[PDB]
């Protein structure tokens, strides 16, 4: 055998950071600019738990206008970063739906996942703390507050759904 | 009518591909010059660029600079493409 690769999904609302998200922990870098997903992919090499790891991320789509994507993605996807923005109420919803799909799609109750409220960085926050990790407690699943601009919980973000999918493989 | 492409670039920055859509009006250049946007490539004119098609482990369709793309592309392949420097 080789290196352990771990087959990681980036999904939400249109808006609310996956793609600087993913830019900022694979490039270390972040430009304001607007470019809507269609399906982007993406690799790194990593250290977690003292195991080194290949990440293969698949960034999506959070414009509706393409949700008949997600059924192939989530068959294939291992553990999934469920992102909401925090000055975004309606993505903080829509957070629901998605993981719904996944778990359907799965056909299981525990698929790993991490909930992630982006945006950390800016004032005027409409998601309280609070809320999310309550929601995040009643899914069983682990909660990072991040901000692709400051590098706040990137890394962490990633590794925790590592630990998450290393944990679920050996249930 | 549409469909969705995948670009690459030969870089080594961490990227396998980023999807764009193709419609049945494109030409190469204005393919090239949405494939330029989508992976911040500006310092350089879409001329000096091509769109190649990968078609199997060692066969290559270079899509010509002014072909109607879905006229020249193989449909019966993944519809995988890199953008590359002539
Ligand atoms: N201030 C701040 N802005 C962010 C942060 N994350 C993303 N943004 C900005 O929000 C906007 C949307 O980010 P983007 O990464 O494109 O969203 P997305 O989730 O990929 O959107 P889509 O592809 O499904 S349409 C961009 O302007 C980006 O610069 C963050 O943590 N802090
Ligand atoms: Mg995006």
């Not at chain 1, 982007?40 to 990593?46: C, I, L, M, P, T």
């Not at chain 2, 769109?51 to 482990?57: D, G, K």
């Amino acid at each position: 055998g080789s290196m352990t690769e771990y087959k990681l999904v980036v999904v939400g609302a249109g808006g609310v950071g996956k793609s600087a998200l993913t830019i900022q922990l694979i490039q270390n870098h972040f430009v304001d600019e607007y470019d809507p997903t269609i399906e982007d992919s993406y690799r790194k090499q990593v250290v977690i738990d003292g195991e080194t790891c290949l990440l293969d991320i698949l960034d999506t789509a959070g414009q509706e206008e393409y949700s008949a994507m997600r059924d192939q993605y989530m068959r294939t996807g291992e553990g999934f970063l469920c992102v909401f923005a925090i000055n975004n109420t309606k993505s903080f919803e829509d957070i629901h739906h998605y993981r719904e799909q996944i778990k359907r799609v799965k056909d299981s109750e525990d698929v790993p996942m991490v909930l992630v409220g982006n945006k950390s960085d800016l004032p005027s926050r409409t998601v309280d703390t609070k809320q999310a990790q309550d929601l995040a407690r009643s899914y069983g699943i682990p909660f990072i507050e991040t901000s692709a601009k400051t590098r706040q919980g990137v890394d962490d973000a990633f590794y925790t759904l590592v630990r998450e999918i290393r944990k679920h493989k050996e249930k | 009518d549409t469909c969705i492409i995948r670009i690459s670039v030969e870089d080594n920055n961490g990227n396998m591909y980023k999807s764009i859509m193709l419609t049945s009006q494109d030409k190469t250049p204005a393919v090239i010059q949405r494939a330029m946007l989508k992976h911040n490539l500006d310092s350089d004119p879409a001329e000096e660029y091509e769109l190649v098609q990968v078609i199997s482990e060692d066969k290559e369709l270079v899509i010509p600079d002014s072909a109607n793309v879905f006229y020249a592309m193989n449909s019966q392949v993944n519809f995988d493409f890199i953008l590359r420097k002539k």
